[PDB]
Structures are given as structure tokens and as C-alpha cells.
Amino acid sequence: DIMVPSFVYNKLPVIHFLQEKRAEQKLRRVLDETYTEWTEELDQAHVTDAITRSLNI
Amino acid sequence: SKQLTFISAGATAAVLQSASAIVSKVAGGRVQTKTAKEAGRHAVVVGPETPIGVHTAVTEVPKSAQDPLFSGVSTVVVRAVLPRAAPDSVQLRDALDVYASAGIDTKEEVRSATEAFKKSAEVAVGKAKAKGVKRIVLVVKQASKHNCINELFKKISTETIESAGLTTEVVGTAAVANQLIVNPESLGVVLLNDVAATEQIELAFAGVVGGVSRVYHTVEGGKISAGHSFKSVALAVAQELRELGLSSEADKVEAAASKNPRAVVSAL
């Protein structure tokens, strides 16, 4: 009725602070590991060159 | 009963009709003449274009049909032919050089090209050994575009020939073509890499000599005749009939071709 309640009350602030920091850490990780991926596609010049070769030119 | 397979590759209908009339009139109906697009034996291909299923494109100077201008010449021109795909699809001779530029993998195509060159090299060295020559002449177009197909062709042809013990001399397309047309007695055996220019050179030599029939060695194993003109087709048919086991008919066709090139059918 008296002791354990008081010590729980004393614990509350530190735990709240640490959990807030942990959540911030996880969202920070979410944004950190995002990168824009630029894909590379076969240049159409080679396609045009192959078309010319097929024509026997 | 027997069958002769006619392949058409860029040949005008007149030549095909002439060939059909010649065989029908000479054979007399004993051997039927069917038309197709691919064969391995008892086949005559009409037209400059290369058919599907041929890996070697040898041609010689037959003694009987020697033109008076080219009397006594003896030179064998063998053109290496890579496997031919559908017209729409990219041919190997072009794929092997464009894919490398594009960065695409070129392992299977290299393997197929290597096999074709080895077979062509084996045919060329066999002809050289039979004729007794010690050195053969490789022909590669020196264009920058064909900087990969020719490189593989040289790397493999020289390897096989040197393994056989004969010498190889590499040359371009213009110099060899001029030499072959002007002074062909200085060349015994000439191999040609698979390019459009080489195909034209082979046709020009086959025609300038007086009109001859080219021999194509196929993957299945065998020899098929090839012609592009009235006289060349007539000689090709005569050789084909000789292979079937007809000597008198073959001689008659050969004589008719020698006398009246453009109208052999009426001549005989």
C-alpha cells in the first residue's frame, strides 16, 4: 500500500523518458535506411545499331 | 520415288522455274522434286542468300567448267557460316558483336560461334591437306564494327590450323578480293569469316570463274549444292543428279550449261 507504490511512482519518469528516446531511435532508423534507387535501362542506341546490322547495311 | 529438295533464298521465281523445268525434263519423273526451306542431303539451294542449316560454304574451280580466261587456276574458297536464326531474330554474326557493346552476356553465342569456326577450320585444313598446300589465307573484314567476331574467328581458326601443323596468313577483304579476281593462282586455300562482304566475294568468285556450284556442309553432315544463276543452278542440279547416281543425265546437263548458259532447259 505504501512502499512499492512510491518506488513505482519514482520509476515512472525515467522509464517514460527512455521509451520516448527508444521510439525516436526507431523512427530515425526508419528514415536512415531509405535510399532512392535509380535504375539503369538498356540504351536504345544499341537497339538502333542492331536494327541497322539486321538490315545488312 | 527419290526426292530432291529445292530451297529458295532470295532467288527470283524465274531461276526456280528454270531449275524445276530442267530437273523434270532431264530426270523424266523418276525422282520427284519437292520444295522446302531446310535440308541435309539431296538438296539444291537457289539464291544468293544463305539457307538455314549450313555451317560451311566451300567452293572450288571445277575442271570441266573452267572459263578460258581462268584455265588452270586451282584455288578453294571456303566461307564459314554461323548458325542462321529466323529473319526477324538477330543473327549471331551481329549479336556476337553488339551484345558485347551493350554489356549483355555472350557465353552461349561465343560457344556456338566457336563450334561453327572449328568445323569450318577443320574443313579448310582438310582441303588444304588434300591439295598439299602448306599455308592458308584467312580473310577478315577490318571494319571497326566487326572487331569482335573477327577476333574470335582469328583466335580459333589459327589455333585449329596451327594444331594441324599448317600456316595461316591473315588479310582483309578488299586486297584478297582484288587478288582473287586478278591473280588467283597465288592463293591455294582461302577461308572467309562470316560477313556480308565475304558472301559477296564468294559469289563474285563463283561467277567470274564462269559459273559454278557452291557446296554447303550442314550440321546434320552432308553436302548440298547451291546456285544463283541459270548456269550455276544447272551445274548444281547436274552435281546433285550425279550424287543420286545418274551419270549420263549429269553429263548432258553439264554440256547444256557449257553451251547455252541462260537457256539450258531449251538447249538440252
Side-chain angles (χ1 to χ4, degrees), chain B residues 32-48:
Chain B
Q32 304 179 359
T33 65
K34 184 174 183 177
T35 303
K37 297 181 179 180
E38 181 276 350
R41 303 182 299 91
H42 300 167
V44 180
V45 61
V46 189

Side-chain angles (χ1 to χ4, degrees), chain B residues 6-106:
Chain B
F6 285 73
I7 309 178
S8 177
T12 59
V15 184
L16 299 175
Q17 193 283 339
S18 61
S20 180
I22 293 160
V23 58
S24 62
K25 180 174 178 180
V26 176
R30 301 196 303 272
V31 47
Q32 304 179 359
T33 65
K34 184 174 183 177
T35 303
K37 297 181 179 180
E38 181 276 350
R41 303 182 299 91
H42 300 167
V44 180
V45 61
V46 189
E49 175 177 1
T50 303
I52 303 175
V54 296
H55 56 54
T56 304
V58 54
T59 170
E60 309 179 4
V61 177
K63 304 175 184 178
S64 301
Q66 293 193 1
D67 182 78
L69 182 63
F70 285 81
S71 301
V73 69
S74 180
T75 183
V76 178
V77 188
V78 184
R79 175 169 62 88
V81 180
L82 308 183
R84 286 287 181 273
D88 303 1
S89 60
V90 183
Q91 305 299 347
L92 173 53
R93 59 179 183 82
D94 302 330
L96 175 56
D97 178 70
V98 70
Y99 294 171
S101 179
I104 304 181
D105 64 331
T106 318

